[PDB]
């Protein structure tokens, strides 16, 4: 169906609110004609000074350019009854990574992690190849269904990136805990590397079940990053002295990288990949394509993997986890 925007929201049965969204609520709902479960993201128009939100417009333009298994795919746009909000429509996903981790109902085996990472990275690689930067990777933006299928979501901060030559981009992107060192240090002409750093944080978080860098503020965050990955310095990161806040934001002692010691409990192949993902110099950081060729992922056959043990009776989304 090419003919978007005309079908009515009342063709869906609204089951319940699953999210609080930037420009409207997110609903679980059911298709009355097909019986299919969907998520509806509301876009409210009324009382907006500038009408339909430029934010949703950007996301819509990006979503429409991406078709991949591991990336959220918007089915149609529907309207409130007329004569007024729109609703973006997506395949319903039972959970997101944050809600699950927080539920305390789940445990992820090495095999589960491999499978999740394989799917996340293939989604990410696809986006990068299309010249999109995600810029908001975090647990709450990764969706998982009961069949154990992963989808990268929330393209609300994504943008096109110039692969041919460098361009200046917005710096305060990515929630702080997942934000890479070059951004904390004020880079504006950054790269798809920023997203891979976010993913290495997820990977580590899957093993410890807690976000691996948890600070309030930027300087504090850099210090925590320094403590694990080593201080940023020219010896490992020559270009670092060119960054705006390098002198201003300086860690507290000149730390050694102790990533491999701190995460020794992790399997060695996972740990290689983690090491590479959390490499401070974005130009040395592995690409999304590189992660897929790693020991940890290269031989993961998805068809041959058992779905994980996820609750089929509770939908573990981030909003739920708070309530
Ligand atoms: N297609 C979907 N299926 C199931 N749940 C979803 C879907 N899209 C979003 N959600 C839930 O709604 C929450 C908000 O969605 P999102 O796209 O992340 O908007 P935002 O973070 O900008 O408010 C997500 O954390 C997720 O838990
Ligand atoms: Mg989100
Ligand atoms: Mg968002
Ligand atoms: Mg590697």
Author numbering: 716 to 798, 807 to 1046
Copy the relevant paper text.
The CDKs and their corresponding cyclins form specific complexes including the Cdk7/CycH/Mat1 complex, which is part of the general transcription factor TFIIH, the Cdk8/CycC kinase module of the Mediator complex, the Cdk9/CycT complex that constitutes the active form of the positive transcription elongation factor (P-TEFb) and the recently discovered metazoan kinases Cdk12 and Cdk13, which both associate with Cyclin K (CycK). The transcription-associated kinases phosphorylate serine residues within the hepta-repeat sequence Y1S2P3T4S5P6S7 of Rpb1, the largest subunit of RNA Pol II. At 1,490 and 1,512 amino acids, respectively, human Cdk12 and Cdk13 are unusually large kinases that share 43% sequence identity and harbour a central kinase domain. The full-length recombinant Cdk12 kinase expressed from insect cells instead showed no kinase activity, indicating either the loss of activation signals or autoregulatory motifs in regions adjacent to the kinase domain. Together, these data suggest that Cdk12 is a promiscuous CTD kinase that has a preference for Ser5 phosphorylations.
We have determined the crystal structure of the human Cdk12/CycK pair in complex with ADP and aluminium fluoride as a transition state mimic at 2.2 Å resolution. Two Cdk12/CycK heterodimers form the asymmetrical unit cell of the protein crystal, whereas no crystallographic density was observed for the substrate peptide but only for the AlF3 transition state mimic. Cdk12 is in the active kinase conformation as characterized by the orientation of the αC helix, also known as the PITAIRE helix (PITALRE in Cdk9). Phospho-T893 within the activation segment is clearly visible in the electron density map and interacts with R858 and R882. The presence of ADP and AlF3 in the crystallization condition led to the incorporation of ADP·AlF3 and two magnesium ions, MgI and MgII, in the crystal structure. We show that Cdk12 contains an additional C-terminal helix, αK, outside the canonical kinase fold that makes multiple water-mediated interactions with both the N- and C-terminal lobes as well as the ribose of the bound nucleotide. A 1038DCHEL motif reaches out to the N-terminal lobe, the ATP ribose and the C-terminal lobe, and interacts with the bound nucleotide by multiple water-mediated contacts. The H1040 Nε2 amine interacts directly with the N3 nitrogen of the adenine base at 3.0 Å. The structure thereby resembles a ‘closed conformation’ for the bound nucleotide in which the free exchange of ADP for ATP is impaired by the intra-molecular contacts of the C-terminal helix formed with the kinase core domain. The approach of the C-terminal helix αK towards the kinase active site is enabled by the presence of a small glycine (G822) in helix αD, which allows for association of this helix with the bound nucleotide.
